């Protein structure tokens, strides 16, 4: 990663769990590190980033196509699509504040949505682009 | 840096100080030009071309494009073309600011295919004095 | 070097000292002329054409063209053609200074096109002594 991405994940995690919806759909189950226990089963997960270095002569920036996946164990997955509807409106047009550097925009990209393991879990990825500035 | 979504172009609905952004507007480009009027004498510094600057005519052109969204402001651009007017357009630069110049509406072209969206491009050219309110 | 848009030709509104530029004029020219009075003797040390200099009559011809902007200074150019008089005019060579002579407006002509603007040309001739105020 570049210098910003340590604080970019800390900002897009704190923008979640303060959004009013998805505190009523997913609950407290927004985490990178999944805590030990019984695995609630409608969680979201925010880790797999990748950077693209949109830089210049004066300073440097980056383009983060970070992935926020929504997992559900429900029978259908209109539960996950309702949960990622709550993910995406919390992030597009972010106006976040970072700890190191700035971001200028948080857009949306590809969002694959398929059946993952043994046709039982339903995971829907959400790729968001974050053009940041170091 | 600044966001690309905050760089907008916008219309005169009523014609007197009423500004709304147009439509689905996927791309904007305010584009400036200068006619580089040459004054090179028989002796000039060793053979380099000398230019005058302020005597040249200068202009601006706006090239907007995006999806066809029928708004109060998309139909307004139609009425400028059929009844030829030069209203006070406005291109806002994220941190520079309002330009506030009279443009004509030189080229409008609505396009559509059998499998995609309804789109339009929208070309302009200058018609008077621009401004810069910072 | 010097810009061409500071080469203004001025017309009298009241006929006494109130000098204003005519209208939107796009090309302007003051043209001086001498008469080359030939004095070629029998002896001319090889047959070179000898000239006299002081004897030839001298003239100044104004040529102005531009767009029809119906200012009051443009109507004062129109009416002095009708009751044909020789009012005082003033050409400002941009950092030479002032020409300040009387001129007769020989040819005025108002032209328009279906796809163009209304344009006027304007040609004047010397009517008396010329000066140079600088």
Q: In chain A, which residue's Cα lies nearest the Cα of B5?
A: A105
How much of chain A is helix, strand and coil, in % rounded to 5? 15, 25, 60
- How far apart are the C-alpha atoms of B85 and B103, rounded to whole Å? 9
**Considering only CA atoms, which of A120, A3, A96 is closest in space to residue A55?**
A3
**Widest distance between CA atoms in chain A:** 52
> Residue B123: beta bridge partners?
B63, B107
Residue pair B65/B17 in contact (Cβ under 8 Å)? The answer is no
Q: Which residues of B touch A (CB under 8 A)?
A: 1-5
How much of chain C is helix, strand and coil, in % rounded to 5? 10, 40, 50
**Widest distance between CA atoms in chain B:** 63
Q: Which residues of B touch A102 (CB under 8 A)?
A: 1
3-class SS at C101?
Answer: strand
Residue pair A87/A126 in contact (Cβ under 8 Å)? The answer is yes
- How far apart are the C-alpha atoms of C63 and C57, rounded to whole Å? 20
Q: Which residues of A touch B (CB under 8 A)?
A: 61, 93, 102, 104-105, 131, 133
Full residue range of the structural domain in which residue A100 is found:
4-133
Q: In chain B, which residue's Cα lies nearest the Cα of C7?
A: B55
What are the φ and ψ backbone dihedral angles of B90, each rounded to 5 degrees?
A: -155, 115
**Considering only CA atoms, which of A65, A53, A64, A46 is closest in space to residue A5?**
A64
Residue pair C102/C67 in contact (Cβ under 8 Å)? The answer is no
The partner residue sitting opposite A133, judged by closest CB among B1, B4, B5, is B1
Query: What is the CA B23 to chain-centroid distance, rounded?
Result: 15
Q: In chain C, which residue's Cα lies nearest the Cα of B53?
A: C3
Rounded alpha-carbon distances, angstroms, from residue A87 to A9, A22, C20: 14, 7, 68
- How far apart are the C-alpha atoms of C67 and C81, rounded to whole Å? 18
DSSP assignment of C58-90, as one string?
-EEEEEEEEE----HHHHHHHHHHHTT---EEE
Helices (H), A16-62: none
Q: Which residues of C touch B (CB under 8 A)?
A: 1, 3-5
Tell which of A54, A105, A108, A131 to mutate to test the B interface (max B CBs under 10 Å).
A105
CA distance A11 to chain B (A): 18
Q: For position A10, which CATH number holds?
A: 3.30.2000.30
How much of chain B is helix, strand and coil, in % rounded to 5? 5, 40, 55
- Work out how many domains chain A is built from and give that number: 1
Q: Which residues of C touch B104 (CB under 8 A)?
A: none
- How far apart are the C-alpha atoms of C113 and C125, rounded to whole Å? 28
Q: Is C116 exposed, middle or buried (0-12, 13-18, 19+ CB in 10 A)?
A: exposed
């Amino acid at each position: 990663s570049y210098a910003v991405a340590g604080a970019l994940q800390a900002a897009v995690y704190q923008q979640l769990r303060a959004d009013a919806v998805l505190a009523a759909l997913v609950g407290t189950a927004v985490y990178d590190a999944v805590p030990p226990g019984p695995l609630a089963g409608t969680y979201v997960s925010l880790g797999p980033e990748d950077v693209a270095d949109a830089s210049d002569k004066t300073g440097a920036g980056a383009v983060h196509d970070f992935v926020i996946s929504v997992i559900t164990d429900a029978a259908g997955f209109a539960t996950a699509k309702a949960a990622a509807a709550a993910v995406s409106d919390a992030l597009v047009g972010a106006d976040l504040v970072l700890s190191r550097g700035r971001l200028v925009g948080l857009w949306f990209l590809r969002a694959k949505a398929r059946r993952v393991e043994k046709a039982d879990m339903r995971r829907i990825d959400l790729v968001f682009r974050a053009r940041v500035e170091g | 840096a600044q966001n690309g979504k905050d760089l907008l172009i916008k219309l005169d609905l009523t014609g007197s100080g009423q500004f709304e952004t147009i439509a689905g507007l996927r791309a904007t480009r305010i584009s400036f030009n200068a006619e580089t009027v040459d004054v090179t004498s028989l002796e000039s510094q060793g053979g380099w071309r000398e230019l005058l600057g302020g005597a040249g005519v200068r202009s601006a052109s706006i090239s907007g494009a995006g999806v066809f969204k029928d708004a109060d402001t998309d139909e307004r651009a139609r009425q400028i073309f059929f009844d030829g007017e030069v209203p006070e357009f406005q291109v806002i630069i994220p941190d520079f600011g309002i330009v506030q110049g009279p443009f004509m509406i030189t080229s409008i072209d609505y396009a559509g295919s059998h499998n995609g969206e309804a789109s339009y491009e929208l070309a302009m050219a200058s018609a008077g004095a621009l401004s810069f309110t910072a």
